[PDB]
Design a binder for these strands. Structure first.
Ligand SMILES: Nc1nc2c(ncn2[C@H]2C[C@H](O)[C@@H](COP(=O)(O)OP(=O)(O)OP(=O)(O)O)O2)c(=O)[nH]1
Ligand SMILES: [Ca+2]
Ligand SMILES: [Ca+2]
Ligand SMILES: [Ca+2]
Ligand SMILES: [Ca+2]
Ligand SMILES: [Ca+2]
Length: 901
DNA sequence: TCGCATAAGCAGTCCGCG
DNA sequence: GCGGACTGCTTAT
């Protein structure tokens, strides 16, 4: 096989590399890599190296990496550009793997681990590590085994061995329900003392050294705890055995309000799953506890135990160990679904970076571009210092707040990356500038043509047309990957809808799910068999179809995120190719494209309807337009349609055969006007929205910018078995909104859009009457909590104290003195409840750590003093009043003359 | 919240507004 | 009460 790196490090003058050799074996080597950097040289000097602007360079070969680094310093002292890849391990990988990397994941050791630490005096601080590690479960992807290290003897209690038999039994048998599919994969090792547990763990680690190391909060908790505990018991040298090169570094992670420490293990790639999830999931969660995320992702119930975690080992060691094992398995289950490890490996190997660098789009793009340019013997410019400066972004149209009955939406495929490609925006393709007219003059095609030679953006920038820039070239490659995966995602989605339809009529038989590839649209053959399947088989097929869709979503959306990140990176001062001329060329072109095409669509529709000055485009944001289709429907007449699907077909056909060719023509003209390199503005129909045929539903509404709801029947070619709500920006979509309130508001919106005013009034009346019975967690607000100290004045709110921070200070006073009560962690999330006047907490609200039950010390007082009235008005009534006034209807029935009877 | 970008919404504080 | 100046937080794209 072709060789591939696993990890790469610079240690002084050596590159340390773990890799897979041509025989599939893991190896390690130390290489005295001689880096090359570059200086500009005279024209008379013959060379094959040129910088990105075509200026000649001489290559400087250094005796070692430190010499190269020192040379960079002296060049700065002199005041001359030191060109080339200054991150020598990236240059090493580029030299050593000069081909597209084909990797084999089965050879990559992926370790998933979790530790337990009993602590009587609150949270066990990893930097102190003063409490024994009493359990480690370490899953190894190569062995496919869970290695369980169990401490039987501790200062906090002596316990009996964990029992695998009890672990396997149902909760109803007094067991722990460790999933049967992992029971045979557990390798259990009890220890009589912590020293032997840890020594054996290190020996084990030496035999099975992780390449990718993951788990939940491992970078912030488990790794520094294990490192520091081993350090405290045995000394530094022993702790450094966690690194295959015996090198570690305390790295200080700084943010706006404070800093924290992690342990860098040289020769290991740490991909903490919490951070993978935050980057790649595109969710914003009320809590990031593993219990909360596991429930959300997998629909598994919370791991249930009595008493505090600090007493679980002594009271129920059996459950203590089983829950440690299950916790590791939960992360593997989330990854089986979401496939974030797979994504990380894909992206890292494509870019030729350390896998952990996938968290940084700047680093990722720096490596992609470097490798691309190196292939042509071109030399990358030195990174430079720039002051942070604001720059303009997208245009967003101010909508008239209203109901909107029939709506068709359109938006650009991969807008910003497509703009980059169309205009040819790149550091080395800048050709000059032209004299800019007000933006509206381009929007209206009255401004003079910018250039008859170069490709232009309305911010004043001109670009070469003779050759593609490196940025367009490399962005196109990832875009193409993205498009492939989105295709699979949409196919799985359409396939899911076929299964849902079939589930209306399940057959009474015993059969099996069909063995199919859900990434491809079901054939007629498959559709026929589906219509004969049982509900059991159909539900399993649906599950598989949805898993396939999830896998496609992960692959496509994060590739979309990467290419959009390149557009953003051009506006980040740490990017090697930072240039506000290019960043603004993208955004300003975007502003023009939207407003240009708004004008074109209005003109086209005013002509087909024979009207004048009529606005068909009601809204748009960045790269999208929302078109009122009421007049299109009314030109046919509602009574001509057999059912909802009939008018949806008509609008879909209208969008595809009339709207889109008109849109394409408008954009082709715009391309010629800007003299762009290639027409790539592809604005396809997104949504077709409206009320169910013959209902009193309103179809959709806008309250304002970035705030709307649509009843959608077809989304990017997916025809739903059941209508789906597209709700953007409203409180139903905000993690800060109480869970039960999100649900109630969504149902209010559903009723507005599908059924009408009277239905909405029925539901509001009922919700208002019953809501006090809702569980307190379900009706609590959520907020991130920053700067708790800033607003804390002797345990009380300082000036301008935010509401949620006030709540935390209330909590802090209420639990004062307790070393055991859960502490609110700076920067994490809290649940927030208002408190009625005259409560014993002495303030108007209380907050506690999100994803948790409030401590029993105060729970009862909180429940007793909860202000349901304030809660209802703020989270439910206020937003609903907003939705309904915008939509011009009433959530409460107004009096009429019929009341006289 | 270490990790690409800007636009823009709403909650809440403080305080004016005769 | 509401709204503006401001902070804080959270979305849409
Ligand atoms: N820098 C940056 N720009 C973004 C981000 N999200 C959206 N944008 C910008 C760039 C996008 O091309 C543009 C339109 O966003 P969309 O959500 O419509 O995505 P896009 O058109 O890229 O892909 P699509 O083909 O519509 O799925 O808005 C982001 O997270 N970072
Ligand atoms: Ca635990
Ligand atoms: Ca788009
Ligand atoms: Ca599309
Ligand atoms: Ca059937
Ligand atoms: Ca869009």
């Amino acid at each position: 096989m072709k060789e591939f790196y696993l990890t790469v490090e610079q240690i002084g003058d050596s590159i340390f590399e773990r890799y897979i050799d041509s025989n599939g074996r893991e190896r390690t080597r130390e290489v005295e890599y001689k880096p090359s950097l570059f200086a500009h040289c005279p024209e008379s000097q013959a060379t094959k190296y040129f910088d990105i602007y075509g200026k000649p360079c001489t290559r400087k070969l250094f005796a070692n990496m430190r010499d190269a680094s020192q040379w960079i310093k002296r060049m700065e002292d002199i005041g001359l550009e030191a060109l080339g890849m200054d991150d020598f391990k990236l240059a090493y990988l580029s030299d050593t793997y000069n081909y597209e990397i084909k990797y084999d994941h089965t050879k990559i050791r992926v370790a998933n681990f979790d530790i337990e630490v009993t602590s009587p005096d609150g949270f066990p601080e990893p930097s102190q590590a003063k409490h024994p590690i009493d359990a480690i479960t370490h899953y190894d992807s190569i062995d496919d085994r869970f290695y369980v290290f169990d401490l039987l003897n501790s200062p906090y209690g002596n316990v009996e061995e964990w029992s695998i038999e009890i672990a396997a039994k149902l909760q109803e048998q007094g067991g722990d329900e460790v999933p049967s599919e992992i029971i045979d994969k557990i390798i259990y090792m009890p220890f009589d003392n912590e020293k032997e547990l840890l020594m054996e763990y290190l020996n084990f680690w030496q035999q099975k050294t992780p390449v990718i190391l993951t788990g939940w909060n491992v970078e912030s908790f488990a790794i520094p705890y294990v490192y520091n505990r081993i350090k405290n018991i045995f000394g530094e040298s022993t702790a450094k055995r966690l690194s295959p090169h015996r090198k570690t570094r305390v790295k200080v992670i700084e943010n706006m309000y404070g800093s924290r420490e992690i342990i860098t293990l040289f020769g290991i790639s740490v991909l903490d799953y919490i951070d993978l999830y935050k980057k790649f999931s595109f969710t914003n969660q009320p809590s990031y506890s593993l219990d909360y995320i596991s429930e959300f992702e997998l629909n598994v119930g919370k791991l249930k135990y009595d008493g505090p975690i600090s007493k679980l080992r002594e009271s129920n060691h059996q459950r203590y160990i089983s829950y440690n094992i299950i916790a590791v398995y939960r992360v593997l289950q989330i990854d089986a679904k979401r496939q974030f490890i797979n994504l990380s490996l894909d992206m890292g190997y494509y870019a030729k970076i350390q896998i952990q660098s996938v968290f940084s789009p700047i680093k990722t793009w720096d490596a992609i571009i470097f490798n691309s340019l190196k292939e042509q013997n071109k030399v990358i410019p030195q990174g430079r210092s720039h002051p942070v400066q604001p720059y303009p972004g997208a245009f967003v149209k101010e909508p008239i707040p209203n109901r909107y009955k029939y709506v068709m939406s359109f938006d650009l495929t991969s807008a910003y990356p497509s703009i980059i490609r169309q205009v040819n925006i790149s550091p080395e393709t800048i050709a000059g500038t032209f004299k800019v007219a007000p933006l509206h003059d381009y929007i209206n095609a009255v401004a003079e043509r910018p250039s008859d030679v170069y490709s232009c953006s309305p911010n004043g920038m001109m670009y070469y047309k003779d050759r593609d820039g490196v940025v367009p070239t490399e962005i196109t490659k990832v875009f193409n990957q993205r498009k492939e995966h989105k295709g699979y995602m949409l196919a799985a989605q359409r396939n899911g809808e076929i299964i849902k339809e079939a589930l209306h009529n399940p057959n009474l038989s015993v059969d099996e799910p069909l063995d199919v590839d859900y990434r491809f649209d079901f054939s007629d053959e498959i559709k026929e068999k589906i219509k004969k399947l049982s509900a059991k088989s159909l539900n399993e097929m649906l599950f598989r179809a949805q898993r396939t869709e999830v896998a496609g979503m992960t692959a496509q959306i994060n590739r979309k995120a990467l290419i959009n990140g390149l557009a953003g990176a051009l506006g980040n001062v740490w990017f090697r190719y930072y240039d506000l001329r290019n960043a603004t060329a993208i955004t300003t072109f975007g502003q023009m494209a939207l407003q240009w095409i708004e004008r074109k669509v209005n003109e086209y529709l005013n002509e087909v309807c024979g009207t004048e000055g009529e606005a068909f485009v009601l809204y748009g944001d960045t790269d999208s337009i929302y078109v009122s289709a009421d007049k299109i429907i009314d030109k046919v007449g509602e009574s001509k349609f057999r059912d909802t699907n009939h008018w949806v077909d008509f609008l879909d056909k209208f969008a595809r055969e009339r709207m889109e060719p008109a849109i394409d023509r408008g954009f082709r003209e715009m391309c010629e006007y800007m003299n762009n390199k290639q027409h790539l503005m592809f604005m396809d129909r997104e949504a077709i929205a409206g009320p169910p045929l013959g209902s009193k539903g309103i179809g959709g509404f806008w309250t304002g910018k970035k705030r709307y709801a649509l009843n959608v029947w077809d989304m990017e070619g997916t025809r739903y078995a059941e209508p789906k709500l597209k709700i953007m920006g409203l409180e139903t979509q905000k993690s800060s909104t109480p869970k039960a309130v999100q649900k109630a508001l969504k149902e209010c919106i559903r009723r507005m859009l599908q059924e009408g005013e009277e239905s909405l009034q029925e539901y509001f009346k009922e919700f208002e009457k019953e809501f006090r019975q809702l569980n307190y967690i379900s009706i609590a607000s959520v907020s991130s909590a920053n700067n708790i100290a800033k607003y804390d004045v002797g345990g009380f709110p300082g000036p301008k104290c935010p509401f949620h921070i006030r709540g935390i200070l209330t909590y802090n006073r209420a639990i004062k003195g307790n070393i055991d009560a859960p502490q609110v962690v700076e920067g994490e999330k809290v649940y927030v409840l208002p408190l009625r006047e005259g409560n014993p907490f002495g303030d108007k609200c209380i907050a506690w750590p999100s994803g948790t039950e409030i401590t029993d010390l105060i729970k009862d007082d909180v429940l007793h003093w909860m202000d349901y009235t304030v809660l209802l008005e703020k989270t439910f009534i206020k937003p609903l009043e907003g939705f309904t006034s915008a939509a011009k209807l009433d959530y409460e029935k107004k009096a009429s003359l019929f009341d006289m009877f």
